[PDB]
Amino acid sequence: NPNYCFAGKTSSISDLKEVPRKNITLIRGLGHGEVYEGQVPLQVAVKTLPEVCSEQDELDFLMEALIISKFNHQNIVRCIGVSLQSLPRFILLELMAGGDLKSFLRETRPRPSQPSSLAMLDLLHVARDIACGCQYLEENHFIHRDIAARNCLLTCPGPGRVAKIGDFGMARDIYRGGCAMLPVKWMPPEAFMEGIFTSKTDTWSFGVLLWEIFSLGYMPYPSKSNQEVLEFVTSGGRMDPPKNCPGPVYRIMTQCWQHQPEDRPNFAIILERIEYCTQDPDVINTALPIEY
Ligand SMILES: Cc1nc(C(C)(C)O)sc1-c1cnc(N)c(O[C@H](C)c2cc(F)ccc2-n2nccn2)c1
Asked: Which of 26, 37, 104, 273 is 20 to 30 A from 90, comparing alpha carbons?
């Protein structure tokens, strides 16, 4: 059984809350290991470990259970418990009915049918929610390493939605692989060049997430491959503003993408700037593009 340290304290597999398998019912697949919607009545997302896997896969699975169970913050998905004493093994997460952020943005883009389905303020609230999660990780000296829209979840589709960081598979791998798998489009130069990760790693990635949000779910660096992005960013290149993106919001992005990690803002500053954007009528009165 592997050890794990967060906020100082060390924990073990024994500290995980084991839920009796009989209390757990699977309802439907969500996507593929496989994840199901389930009930324990508490509604849960059930992350499963394939019964056919390597011992490294097992260790990875246990470790992410330890990681998520030890966080306590409103913008990080909760772990209800685990079921490790039956096969296949389960990790039980808070079921975020809004689904993942990237799908949400893609499916909820304003259109002729729904012209105002989404507004700038909705995007700013998502951005603020995730930044608050990142600030919590930063102040607890946890480096996420893969801050990206695909790794965020929403509590519901409607205006009251809350965004949370929902996946920690990358930080898990490095805590203990391939180049064409590293999220190079979300990584700062010192990360993909030198393998150096610091709190300022997540700041850069958050800038890219910001772009994903205000582009409404487009893939970063449109039309560029990983290697072209690597060379582009290493040469000082940066993404243009998303369509209709207010200057104050783009400015947050460009500050997140400063070449020197020391020149990039910490998350307390990012949150201050996101707050200012939400107060600025010129920002929130800006209409999102309508997709025909
Ligand atoms: C209801 C629901 N619908 C979704 C769609 C199909 C739109 O994508 S995801 C989703 C959901 C809700 N709550 C969770 N706790 C949860 O967790 C998994 C581990 C997860 C966590 C992430 F951070 C990112 C992605 C995924 N993931 N997505 C598919 C498979 N894995 C998923």
From this structure: 104
**Could you give the CA distance from residue 108 to residue 176 in angstroms, rounded to a whole number?**
37
Structural biology method used: X-ray
Handedness of CA 175, 179, 181, 182 (dihedral sign): positive
Amino acid, res. 236: G
* Superfamily for domain range 1-95: Phosphorylase Kinase; domain 1 (3.30.200.20)
Q: For residues 204 and 187, is the Cβ–Cβ distance under 8 A?
A: yes
Query: For residue 78, what are its two tokens?
Result: 């909760």
Please give the CATH architecture assigned to the domain spanning 96-280: Orthogonal Bundle (1.10)
With H, G, I as helix, E, B as strand and everything else as coil, classify residue 5.
Answer: strand
Q: Which helix (H) or strand (E) holds 158?
A: none
| 224 carries a ligand binding annotation | no
Q: Residue 240 — φ and ψ, nearest 5°?
A: -70, 165
Asked if 271 contacts 131 with a C-beta cutoff of 8 angstroms, the reply is yes
CA distance readout (Å), 106 to 28, 101, 118, 213, 282: 22, 9, 11, 10, 25
- As a whole number of angstroms, the longest Cα–Cα distance in the chain is 56
Shortest-distance Cα residue to atom 11 of ligand 1: 99
What distance in angstroms lies between residue 48's CA and the mean position of ligand 1's atoms? 13
**Collapsed DSSP state (helix, strand, coil) of residue 38:** strand
Which residues share a beta bridge with 26?
Answer: 38
Q: Flag whether 9 is marked binding.
A: no
Whether 122 is catalytic: no
Ligand 1 center–CA 285 separation, angstroms: 31
What Å resolution does this PDB entry report? 2.0
